[PDB]
Amino acid sequence: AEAYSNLGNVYKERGQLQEAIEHYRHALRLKPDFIDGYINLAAALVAAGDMEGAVQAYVSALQYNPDLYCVRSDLGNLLKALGRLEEAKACYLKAIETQPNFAVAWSNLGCVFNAQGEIWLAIHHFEKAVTLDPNFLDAYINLGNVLKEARIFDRAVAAYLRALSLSPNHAVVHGNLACVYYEQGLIDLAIDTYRRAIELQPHFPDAYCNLANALKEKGSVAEAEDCYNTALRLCPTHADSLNNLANIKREQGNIEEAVRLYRKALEVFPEFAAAHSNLASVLQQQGKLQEALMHYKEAIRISPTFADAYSNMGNTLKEMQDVQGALQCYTRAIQINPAFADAHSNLASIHKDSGNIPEAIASYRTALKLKPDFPDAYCNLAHCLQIVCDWTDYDERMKKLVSIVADQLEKNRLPSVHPHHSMLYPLSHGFRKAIAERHGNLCLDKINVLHKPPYEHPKDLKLSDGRLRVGYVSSDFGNHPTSHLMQSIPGMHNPDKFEVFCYALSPDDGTNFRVKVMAEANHFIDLSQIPCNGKAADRIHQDGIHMNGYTKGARNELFALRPAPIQAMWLGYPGTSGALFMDYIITDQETSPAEVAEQYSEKLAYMPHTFFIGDHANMFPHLKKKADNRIVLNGIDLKAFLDSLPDVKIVKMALNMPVIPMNTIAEAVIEMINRGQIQITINGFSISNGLATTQINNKAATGEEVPRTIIVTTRSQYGLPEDAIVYCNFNQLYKIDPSTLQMWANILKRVPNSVLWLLRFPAVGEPNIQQYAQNMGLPQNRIIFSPVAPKEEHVRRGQLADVCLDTPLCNGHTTGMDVLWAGTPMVTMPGETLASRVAASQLTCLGCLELIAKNRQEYEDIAVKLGTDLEYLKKVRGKVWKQRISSPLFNTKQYTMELERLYLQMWEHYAAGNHMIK
Amino acid sequence: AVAWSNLGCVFNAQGEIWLAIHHFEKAVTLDPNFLDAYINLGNVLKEARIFDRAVAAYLRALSLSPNHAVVHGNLACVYYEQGLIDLAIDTYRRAIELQPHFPDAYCNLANALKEKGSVAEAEDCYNTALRLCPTHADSLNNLANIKREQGNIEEAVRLYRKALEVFPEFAAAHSNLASVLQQQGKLQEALMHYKEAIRISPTFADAYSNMGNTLKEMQDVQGALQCYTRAIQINPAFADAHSNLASIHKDSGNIPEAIASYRTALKLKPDFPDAYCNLAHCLQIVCDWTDYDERMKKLVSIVADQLEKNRLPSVHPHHSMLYPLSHGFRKAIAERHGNLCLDKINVLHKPPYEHPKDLKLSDGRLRVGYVSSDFGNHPTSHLMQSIPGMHNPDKFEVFCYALSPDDGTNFRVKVMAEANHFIDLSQIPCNGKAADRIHQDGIHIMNGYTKGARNELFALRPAPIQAMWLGYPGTSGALFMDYIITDQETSPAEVAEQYSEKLAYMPHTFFIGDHANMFPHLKKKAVIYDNRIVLNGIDLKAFLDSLPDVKIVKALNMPVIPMNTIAEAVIEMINRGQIQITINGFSISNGLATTQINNKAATGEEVPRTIIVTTRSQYGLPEDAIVYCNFNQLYKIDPSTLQMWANILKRVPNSVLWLLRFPAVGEPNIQQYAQNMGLPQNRIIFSPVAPKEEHVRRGQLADVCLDTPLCNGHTTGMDVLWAGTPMVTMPGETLASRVAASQLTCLGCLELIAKNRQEYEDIAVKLGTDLEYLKKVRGKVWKQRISSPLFNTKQYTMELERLYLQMWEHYAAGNKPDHMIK
């Protein structure tokens, strides 16, 4: 009863709790209406902590007497402890309806909703409380907490200050207000409030963590590190401190220790998706790609909100060539938010690799406007523009590019430009060599992972059976012009004193040239399945050796391993590679005199006559003679067809210009050309046009096969005026500069009937070219753009014009030899760098002293003369046609002999322990 | 989905901001393409000052509707909320293109300019908005604000009037209205519109602050205090409310309270030179010499800056003589205050009055009128009350001009009868009427820079010659004032540089008090030491003759009474604090009881008829020590002066100093500083307030009076010289730094004037040490206080009238005012 319940109270006060609870139960059984009995009931339940016992006891109490107000408050406390929120809210509603004012119960409901997740109602009820409870420490504290959750810090400062009025010093409230200040950006206010918290009590380690976060906001490395360490000493239970300490340590450069911190933090809890990102990033930095991808996928699967995970996984897929997956990741990242410009920059790189230049240009513009200093994005945008040759804001862009070049050169960062792109920006020779050296030692940084001991370079040929073991190493043995330039030399390489080793490093294509050169080699090697440069280097060292350079996908770090005693760059890159392991480089005096060695990082091997090589004497010998270049015809049986003709017009020159009268054969040919027919047969000779030779024989069109049929070609097939002196040049838009185009405009204005022949390289840039020509005052008739044709037909249609063109920006090597074998002459102006001196040296080997201009004006004047002086033009054309065969320019066998002589010089130099001059 | 949006819109209409944002966040989750919902959510977020969320909602809304006018307008409103210039201006351009017919867009754009500086385009957009409509009276408001910035004052007045006439719903408009009313000088309507605005919105505290400023112009001190209270309770952080509250407390003499509130302002703003200088003045009053040099030098910098910044000088010219600044600085501040007069007189639009150059209009005489509010209970009237009666009616006509209501004091009505004419100007609210009356009086030739002096009247120039004499011991800086009276020594040519008026040199001095009239009973006294016990009375000689024997100690002598039954009975009465007794039929009293026995005679209105005795021991004054004395106002004392006094004390074996509590709040710090300067508490004596007669009388017991080098004791010097008492003084820098030496020269005792502070201490100790020297000096000063005409107020009037003769001979000959030499 009442007295027995109070005796139970005495029992609890004296310490005998169980007797207390038994007497409470007894008194309740006597009269359940006991308010004191219910109080002792609740006290016993709380001491026991029985959730269901307390729940049912309070249900019985409330149904017995619902007036109990604070009892409903403790009921809500219990329901919150359970976690079931609807019961708590219903109880709060019942209490408020029964008695309107419960600011404490309203605070309880506010915390309930804070658990529920609706900030706004929470702050609303907080204000309700602070109104009806002007002094309520919990109300203001939780209000500040909810505002901190909602990022609305300003009201939180006032709420926490009023709580401070209620509690003049409390560490938790100080830390919360410090977080409010940090989210305010109030660095000093935040650090002060955090130090107020720690002086309130140094127990909280997360206090140290947050203080060191403020320190990092101020950038104090060591002090923040000390705070993090001390917090770990107090508690390593939470891994946020470990995570940020790992972050800063990672920034320090002591890598693997911070890596271990990352991994153990993630061990503490997988929820640190950011730590997962850091781990995958360092995995990529070390080359652990697949696991990094797995971690990024994990982070996305747990946290689809973030997108820079997509960015970095796209970076991984770039490292692993997964273009499709990378683009998917970029799409997801941009879909989350496009404000992350560098993601669009990587997507632009992807499109550039894909040829979607305009999208990349637009994305790069968006990035650069987003962040003014994105030197890599700026450089890549410039590269895309030079791809499309849009000279809008041309020279100012070049100037800012030079500025970015110097800026990145100073701060020891990777030059955003590429060595192939170097000629697009005529910077200093020092800039050239610095970029090349940095990119060459990019191989060194990768090769350092295995720390392979240096190979014992053989010194004598006795190990190699008295023969020179030469290893030709390239992944480009296939659909590539360089192969289409030197593939015959392996066969023509002399096996008498030299052994041939050829190393394929890319998936095979099945082309005739591939297996052809494979058979040419004394030893073909298929390295295209060795992911480790070390294994390939070991294989080479086994081969005891005594082509790609800065090319897409190339992995020349094996050269940095120097498995051969002599390593020299040649035909791989148009210039020096900045490679300390490239002992020599093969060039000529005409293009590389000893005086320009200031920009050269390798020793110079001098070719007595020429360095470049091509074998259209074998690649396309059928075009050695043809049947002045308006409508031209060629075929395997040219002389046989001519002798099968009724009448042939003979033009004297041991040479002649074969001329056919406009007879029935000629008229039928013209009709077939005009009707776009497949081909016809005349006199038993297959007469074909070039517009569908692939449908006739694509392999023959590739030059793998010499076209056995007979091809007649007319400029009218392109709709050209068949009575005009036509200029031509077909290289990609990169070789084009505004100044040379204006000089060409001057040439075309000087020459009465002057038009220019162009190839769509690429296509979509035509409007810019037309606008530039109009601003240079030349009509559309002066320029014609055409789709691309295979190499054989490329050279075939090249000789249609009387003269080609030269851009001293980048010299002519591919098309230079194409036209050297086309018999159509061309003039050029030498440059400073090798890439601007290729065609020049080609013509020096040709020996035409008058095909070099020492100034742009000289170039223009000679161009006008030759396009106008048709008698001098004909003499030059005949001299070119004679000398392209008479000269050893295509004597690839004797070229091979002289290369062997140069190899003899190299091995005499090395074997004696020691630049090669002839 | 949309239904929850509608319910949230309803709840926002009910005014639940947070329920509104909750429901609208729910709606935007329900419909990501709910443009109008994003609009409403951003709007309510802005209502609740929630910037970033409104930013996001509005960015989405623009993605859903690329162009809506009010959308972009409120976007720019939030842009103002966080304050970004380019965002604001570009949003304004997009708004004006979106809807040209929307004035408030132009208004906020003008606000952007206002924070930027393109005030031109600001007013331009104002005009454009007016062209669209004058309904948006907000435009009227802020355009009148920028006009007030410019100075098209009356035009701005028109703007504010018409804007309020559009609608009174904009309290700030009423506020600026009352502000300009105060600026021009009309008060009652300003207060009424203050109350109008406060009725509309009682929230604005500085509204109450300016109400209080207007009331202080009305001089309703209680109104000032109540407005201060309401303002500071609405906001204590408003440093200006505290500053002006402390100013009013300084007016009420609450110097510590003013110091506290002024330090409150200084913490609310580190450098508020106005409250800074007023706090400094309060410190000077209390002489809290802590933070001495930093405060005073920052004041020097402040006054130089405001000389450059052409602002209101914070240091009042009364305090000019206090701060050690330049002659140019002080006369420049004086000229600034002269402008503060002339600008106000400009609205009176009165062309200059006629200025006679003859005597016939004044029936062969010269009309000189005297204007002041100090007619009555004021030291000036206590200095020169009888001289108006001593003016010659044969050559001059006397005119009085009361600037204060009559107090009924004897001096007041006495001088009113002395003057040939009295005028009660204190009844005239308009300066124009007073100047017209003066011109009616035909005046050709007294407070100066002081409290309540309507100096604008002198600015009005109703008299051809306007001069200031002994009214305020500093220059005016106002060229409309012509002359100032001085002597050969105090204000020589080398100091003439700091006067905007012409100088007037008296024969030997220009100072005079009514001691010879108000206190002649001390002409001779009654009491081996010299001034241990003092007794005087009208029947003093009769009592002495009624005595058994009276000793005579030297035509001049010192009456002495032996220690007989009567003398010892007087001693006992003193030790008992008896009100009064009567011996031999002669009533015997003390000054301490003269408050009730005869307050009128104690005030100098009457000569004390009774015989009154007093001695040192009445207040703990040792009877065998060298007692130096000085009793001026506390602010006239500085640490350097106290240290000079410390040197003088340490150069005398047993010397004590008598002082006053003026008031007493600062005395503890004073004595603490004295202890810091090695001065024992026994060596200093303090006394409470004493009325004129007794405070003058008590000096005779003391030995030597003192003069502060910075400022002389104007009243005090006359008080001590009428007692035949030596005093130490030195020629200083300011005019008020040479008055005491001027009186010493007038007495001719030049050896009592020291040339330096070292010589100051030398002469002080020399006097306080040698018995023959001190006694003979005291006696000779006693002799010469009557032998010299120093108190001949009639001869003072004679020389004043001779100077009048010379001045009128110069002026009536067409000459502009010129320095009077001899």
Short mmCIF file of all heavy atoms in Angstrom, two decimals, chain B residues 350-358 361 435-436 438-444 460-465, unseen atoms left out:
data_model
loop_
_atom_site.label_atom_id
_atom_site.label_comp_id
_atom_site.label_asym_id
_atom_site.label_seq_id
_atom_site.Cartn_x
_atom_site.Cartn_y
_atom_site.Cartn_z
N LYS B 350 18.70 88.22 -42.99
CA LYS B 350 18.63 89.63 -42.62
C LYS B 350 19.79 90.39 -43.24
O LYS B 350 20.95 90.06 -42.96
CB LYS B 350 18.65 89.79 -41.11
N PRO B 351 19.54 91.39 -44.08
CA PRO B 351 20.63 92.24 -44.54
C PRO B 351 21.23 93.00 -43.38
O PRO B 351 20.57 93.20 -42.34
CB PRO B 351 19.94 93.18 -45.54
N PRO B 352 22.48 93.44 -43.50
CA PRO B 352 23.15 94.09 -42.37
C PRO B 352 22.40 95.33 -41.91
O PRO B 352 21.87 96.10 -42.71
CB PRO B 352 24.53 94.45 -42.93
N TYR B 353 22.35 95.51 -40.59
CA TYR B 353 21.70 96.67 -40.00
C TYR B 353 22.50 97.94 -40.29
O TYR B 353 23.69 97.90 -40.60
CB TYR B 353 21.55 96.50 -38.49
N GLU B 354 21.81 99.07 -40.18
CA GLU B 354 22.48 100.36 -40.27
C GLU B 354 23.44 100.52 -39.09
O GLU B 354 23.11 100.15 -37.96
CB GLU B 354 21.46 101.49 -40.29
N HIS B 355 24.62 101.08 -39.36
CA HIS B 355 25.64 101.27 -38.34
C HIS B 355 25.99 102.75 -38.22
O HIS B 355 26.70 103.29 -39.08
CB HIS B 355 26.89 100.45 -38.67
N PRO B 356 25.49 103.44 -37.19
CA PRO B 356 25.81 104.86 -37.04
C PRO B 356 27.29 105.08 -36.78
O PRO B 356 27.99 104.22 -36.23
CB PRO B 356 24.97 105.29 -35.83
N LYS B 357 27.78 106.25 -37.20
CA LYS B 357 29.17 106.63 -37.01
C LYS B 357 29.30 107.92 -36.20
O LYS B 357 30.34 108.59 -36.26
CB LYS B 357 29.87 106.80 -38.36
N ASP B 358 28.28 108.28 -35.43
CA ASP B 358 28.21 109.58 -34.79
C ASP B 358 27.82 109.43 -33.32
O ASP B 358 27.63 108.32 -32.81
CB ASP B 358 27.20 110.49 -35.50
N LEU B 361 22.98 110.70 -32.78
CA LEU B 361 21.90 109.73 -32.64
C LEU B 361 21.83 109.19 -31.21
O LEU B 361 20.77 108.75 -30.76
CB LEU B 361 22.09 108.58 -33.63
N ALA B 435 17.94 90.93 -32.50
CA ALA B 435 18.84 91.79 -33.26
C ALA B 435 18.15 93.08 -33.66
O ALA B 435 18.75 94.16 -33.63
CB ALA B 435 19.36 91.05 -34.49
N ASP B 436 16.87 92.99 -34.05
CA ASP B 436 16.10 94.19 -34.36
C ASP B 436 16.00 95.10 -33.15
O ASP B 436 16.15 96.32 -33.26
CB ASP B 436 14.71 93.80 -34.86
N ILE B 438 18.10 95.28 -30.67
CA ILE B 438 19.42 95.87 -30.45
C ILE B 438 19.63 97.05 -31.38
O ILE B 438 20.10 98.12 -30.97
CB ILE B 438 20.51 94.81 -30.65
N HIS B 439 19.28 96.88 -32.66
CA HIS B 439 19.41 97.99 -33.60
C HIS B 439 18.51 99.16 -33.21
O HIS B 439 18.89 100.32 -33.40
CB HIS B 439 19.09 97.52 -35.02
N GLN B 440 17.33 98.86 -32.66
CA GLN B 440 16.49 99.92 -32.11
C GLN B 440 17.21 100.66 -31.00
O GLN B 440 17.15 101.89 -30.92
CB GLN B 440 15.18 99.33 -31.57
N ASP B 441 17.91 99.92 -30.14
CA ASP B 441 18.68 100.53 -29.06
C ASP B 441 19.87 101.32 -29.58
O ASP B 441 20.48 102.05 -28.79
CB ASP B 441 19.15 99.45 -28.09
N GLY B 442 20.21 101.19 -30.85
CA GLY B 442 21.31 101.96 -31.42
C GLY B 442 22.65 101.68 -30.77
O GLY B 442 23.43 102.60 -30.53
N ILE B 443 22.92 100.42 -30.47
CA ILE B 443 24.14 100.05 -29.75
C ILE B 443 25.31 100.03 -30.71
O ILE B 443 25.25 99.39 -31.77
CB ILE B 443 23.97 98.70 -29.05
N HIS B 444 26.38 100.75 -30.36
CA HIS B 444 27.56 100.83 -31.21
C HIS B 444 28.61 99.80 -30.82
O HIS B 444 28.98 98.94 -31.63
CB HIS B 444 28.14 102.24 -31.15
N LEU B 460 24.73 88.02 -36.11
CA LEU B 460 23.79 88.88 -36.83
C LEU B 460 24.30 90.31 -36.96
O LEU B 460 23.84 91.04 -37.85
CB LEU B 460 22.43 88.88 -36.14
N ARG B 461 25.23 90.72 -36.11
CA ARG B 461 25.86 92.04 -36.17
C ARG B 461 24.86 93.20 -36.14
O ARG B 461 24.84 94.03 -37.05
CB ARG B 461 26.74 92.13 -37.41
N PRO B 462 24.03 93.30 -35.10
CA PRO B 462 23.17 94.48 -34.96
C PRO B 462 23.90 95.70 -34.41
O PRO B 462 23.31 96.79 -34.38
CB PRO B 462 22.09 94.00 -34.00
N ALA B 463 25.14 95.53 -33.98
CA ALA B 463 25.98 96.62 -33.52
C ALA B 463 27.18 96.75 -34.43
O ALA B 463 27.75 95.74 -34.85
CB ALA B 463 26.44 96.38 -32.07
N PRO B 464 27.59 97.97 -34.79
CA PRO B 464 28.77 98.13 -35.65
C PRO B 464 30.04 97.57 -35.03
O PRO B 464 30.89 97.05 -35.76
CB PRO B 464 28.86 99.65 -35.85
N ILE B 465 30.19 97.67 -33.72
CA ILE B 465 31.37 97.17 -33.01
C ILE B 465 30.91 96.06 -32.08
O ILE B 465 30.05 96.28 -31.22
CB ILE B 465 32.09 98.28 -32.24
#
